[PDB]
Amino acid sequence: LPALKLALEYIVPCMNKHGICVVDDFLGKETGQQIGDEVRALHDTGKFTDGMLVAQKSDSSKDIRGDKITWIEGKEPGCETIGLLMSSMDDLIRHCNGKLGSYKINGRTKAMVACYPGNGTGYVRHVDNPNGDGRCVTCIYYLNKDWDAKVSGGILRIFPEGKAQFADIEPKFDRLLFFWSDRRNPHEVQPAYATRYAITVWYFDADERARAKVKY
Ligand SMILES: O=C(O)CNC(=O)c1ncc(-c2cccc(Cl)c2)cc1O
């Protein structure tokens, strides 16, 4: 599917109506598996952090850590298919521009690659951008082959429009997810009992980002 068709016929109407959009089979099995291989190699060669401190504990031997991260620009050797994914995300957003709300998107973060180690940790309920830091759209790509949430957990639960009625999104292989980054979409990751990977980029709105500059 050409990016403009996906954008105009699906992403733009889904985002403006619901603030959330799920695209399955985004890149196809071959590219999806190559991204998986690159992320696993990052993991196996120690490129991730040790994980978010979950419980601090007076005996630090008992510390519990959760999601581990690494920031990826997309041009590093061994990361060029992650770079292909990132360019594919940009292609979609570029073909949306002027139609995602009244936002004018003019940049994005590097990719945050996340690894949940499977030790029963998740991610607490939160809003990505609660305080106007410039980020207007969250984009997540999942790469977990044959993920079964009834067995392994790890559901992303989003509370669309902030209301208590929630949407449960499995972190399925080759699934792409967009949602508004602000308080319209509080969300959380339920405990994961197997290794769970995801790649996130955030897109900036020009006006909000130009003002966040003075909030820094
Ligand atoms: O994995 C998923 O399906 C959902 N993940 C998130 O919702 C998330 N959100 C925010 C952050 C995050 C929040 C603050 C700082 C940084 Cl570097 C990352 C990490 C995160 O993993």
Ligand SMILES: [Fe+2]
């Ligand atoms: Fe988040």
